Symmetry: D2
Subunit: 292 residues, 4 copies
């Protein structure tokens, strides 16, 4: 049993004044709220019990939007990150929710799309020791945690936001950990940047010969919705796909329904209140069409 | 002296589940909140005293966001629309804020761009008797109040959302009224569609020979941000303009600064708290560059 | 050994007047000509000997753009389709180029993207008997050849452009055939619509128990660039991906280089003439970076 | 009488390999070929007699597409620019076509949109002495001819692509000239960059007190379609406008029809051959609808 964490906190300024009226993870990406994406990512990994971490001001809202998750067959819980001192704090804030289980952490503004994405998730989720992360070739690695490989395809280092990247592979914001993470996190010291870095956690596993780094090929799409532009590009990306397929990307109800975490009846209940619009209309159509 | 009303109420149902997270009028259009646009529209018309109407749940937010307007040289007030019974209710709800003055009403999801927009606004604003509206050729008139013209360019009828439009000219969501509006509004009867229609208000002025209908040419851009798609198209429209010009569209601070409703000092104060981002950076640059 | 055909003909009037200036398959999709996409598709399927079919007016151009293929390790040939009498004509027109080999046919305005696309293609290409096609859930099946499945996932019918589609699965424009196709094509009679239909070809295989229909999941992206809008959406789709990754989609030189159909030296030669721009810059960077 | 020139030459390597396939000024912007835009610009300025300059390979094509202009009430002629030695060569190459008349020069990849564009053009076109140019605030002036104003709104310098721009006002690619241009051009010496620069031509008029520089306000849109990205942004810009209005931007037939250069009958003839698609459908609808 792995548990999941969505870290959806974070500093508004960049987005201000657009986010003067809402946290970033509540803005829509095309037709549904941002947080549905990463949420639906953990769901496709088979994770049902998930803790959502946000700012004090934003928690109640997330809560107002997702509830406890029982309607989607999930078990959701919440917690607060008073101040943005590093993603790695997630493990401290979430220490008691994790207990002695396996876990996974996904950042609230990461958005993933692609064929067999669940088999890919599956490999990592099913591992029971060490940590796994993913690597994705990008144009501006400098903006991310960067991982270097040797000629044998083996990972040999990680640097966070380097001025001189040793490769073009970035480590995305989806991480799988075993039971050693909490403790590892407990010994970190704030970076100069003054944060507790997930990169440092990852490196720790690396220094022990226990970091697994799988490639996410160029056939997948990994987008981050952190700037006005990117938000827009992602919004257009989904809309292109959705309109072409007549299917939705990252619709939690559908995924729950497909994993048998809720049944045809629950699904109908979910749709009723949304019937006046396409979303509900979509949910309804799902009960009468096989989708492979 | 004309007073202004922004009707920003609204059953968010359509834009669901996104608006499950925030009223429509708080979502961003590219880089600032939707409401800035229509607000900036009244501003360009010379109007400083404005009432904002919204749902009960949304009011406090709007309030949290704009304040009383003093920082921008405005005088903002607020009111509630318990239930979406027609735009025309705005005049009842707003009867005492209007008093015996001229007024103007603009819908919160209407977005206007174009050269000399302000002279255009000015013609109407400066009229002191009757009402003025604007007409804009569109592809799907059926979705709007439609106005018909005779061979002489004169307006001869108005139908709201007709199955068979008599023209391709829609009447946009910006309206100027004299002192007769409140009483006219007092005698309306809900439409079948069960609402008090602005179109009925406009028709009343028409049946008296007092409705002025100016054309807004194809050289302007009138967009409504009421669906996921249109929200996205508008976001991309502004982004294209803003990135090309290095100027913003509908930035209230700038407009206040240009009308001399606030001075260089106040402007600087407004920017300080925003300095970490481009918005503030933008505001600052405005104090040292002449922009014709 | 399978041979390939790209059918890039037709008048393509849905794009008038853009195409008064060139054929549809020469217009760019973001940053390279349309025809590169399907071309690159056959290439990923392992196919090096390809016949390109087009209108009489367009052939020289294509021929002016791709040459004989030797620079990319291919063997390209050309042939004409005097008049748009059905995709199935491709097999008549191409009867002698096919000879007694296995073949594949891809339409010029179909564009494919996604993880493991090359294994997917590989399944079908390595089959040596019968036919294989792909089915893709879409919003408007009525526009395409539609395939229906039973409860057991087995295909049980094909209809071209039905008014009442039996499913939402469209058959895309990528087809794999054994040696029976030519003769099958020789016995077709023009449809009412007045064309020799691929759908009929497919049906013939079906009626013999020899049509293989694999599902292309919602994790892939199949777009057709036949209208102004779709052209534009695709362009923005590729641009989003390319700019995010620092990699190109459907760049024939790269693919040839990865299949060892050309070597580092050839690749360098290819890049020289393009050095003043990014495309060449891209090709150059490929010789010094490992890309998993 | 002013005569016009469209300089639509060059390689446009920035558009490789899309432009291998065809010259830049043939690619579509959304729904019609690029060259229609600047063409339609001169048309709105009242200019009917136009010389189109292009590369030797591209001329026949342009000629294949536009003819001699009689169908649109124009008089079109062609000439070649063997090598890209500066825009200013346009005046040499076009010396005999201009004769002793007033003239105007517009670059092939400049695109213009906005309210009263046609009065703006009119001011300049009706002047009969000196030269006029327009200035547009932009984000990256370094890329263009840049003009500096004094506190009094008066132009006081022009620099082409400066490393340190003295302002954010770029001079767009539309120029009006009196009879002194040819001779002025005859004395230019190639710039270091090895071109005969329009900026030098402009500067000459400036040094004599005869250069008029009008501001094109932020209410207009000036875009250039010289890169893949910009091409794509422009396409989406026009599509947003066209689909909202049910009207086209830069449709030469319409403009001819509105200036009475052709009549209803000619217009019908023009539409026939295009009836199978929207463009022609558009042209037809124009005969029965008044568009203010
Ligand atoms: O969002 P941040 O804190 O700038 O960066 C975080 O996000 C990125 C993924 O989105 C990671 O690659 C960085 O290692 C992580 O520190
Ligand atoms: O937004 P509604 O209530 O469908 O319609 C309202 O908005 C439109 C403008 O956006 C107007 O044309 C309608 O006449 C007005 O009734
Ligand atoms: O492009 P066409 O001739 O309308 O139709 C062709 O295109 C589609 C794919 O693009 C196929 O699904 C159709 O079966 C085929 O006939
Ligand atoms: O296209 P070019 O040759 O780099 O630049 C040309 O175009 C610009 C407008 O597009 C002008 O501002 C420049 O002065 C002119 O030389």
């Amino acid at each position: 049993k792995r548990k999941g964490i969505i870290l959806a906190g974070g500093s508004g300024t960049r987005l201000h004044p657009a986010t003067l009226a809402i946290s970033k993870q509540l803005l829509p990406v095309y037709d549904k709220p941002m947080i549905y994406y990463p949420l639906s990512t953990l769901m496709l990994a088979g994770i049902r019990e998930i803790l959502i971490i946000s700012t004090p001001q934003d928690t109640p809202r997330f809560q107002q939007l997702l509830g406890d998750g029982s309607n989607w067959g999930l078990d959701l819980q919440y917690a607060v990150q008073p101040s943005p001192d590093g993603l790695a704090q997630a493990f401290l804030i979430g220490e008691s929710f994790i207990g002695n289980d396996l876990s996974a952490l996904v950042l609230g503004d990461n958005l993933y799309y692609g064929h067999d994405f669940h088999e890919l998730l599956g490999s990592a989720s099913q591992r029971q020791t060490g940590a796994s992360v993913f690597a994705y070739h990008v144009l501006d690695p400098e903006r991310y945690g960067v991982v270097e490989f040797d000629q044998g395809g083996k990972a040999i280092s990680l640097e966070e936001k380097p001025l001189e990247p040793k490769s073009n592979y970035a480590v995305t914001g989806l991480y799988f950990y075993d039971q050693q993470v909490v403790d590892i996190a407990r010994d970190l010291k704030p970076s100069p940047r003054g944060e507790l870095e997930i990169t440092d956690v990852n490196r720790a596993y690396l220094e022990r010969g226990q970091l697994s780094v799988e490639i996410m090929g160029r056939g997948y799409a990994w987008l981050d919705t952190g700037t006005h532009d990117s938000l827009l590009e992602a919004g257009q990306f989904i809309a292109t796909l959705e309109n072409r397929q007549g299917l939705k990307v990252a619709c939690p109800e559908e995924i729950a329904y497909r994993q048998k975490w809720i049944d045809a009846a629950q699904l109908e209940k979910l749709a009723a209140p949304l019937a006046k619009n396409g979303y509900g209309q979509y949910l309804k159509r799902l009960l009468t069409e096989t989708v492979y």
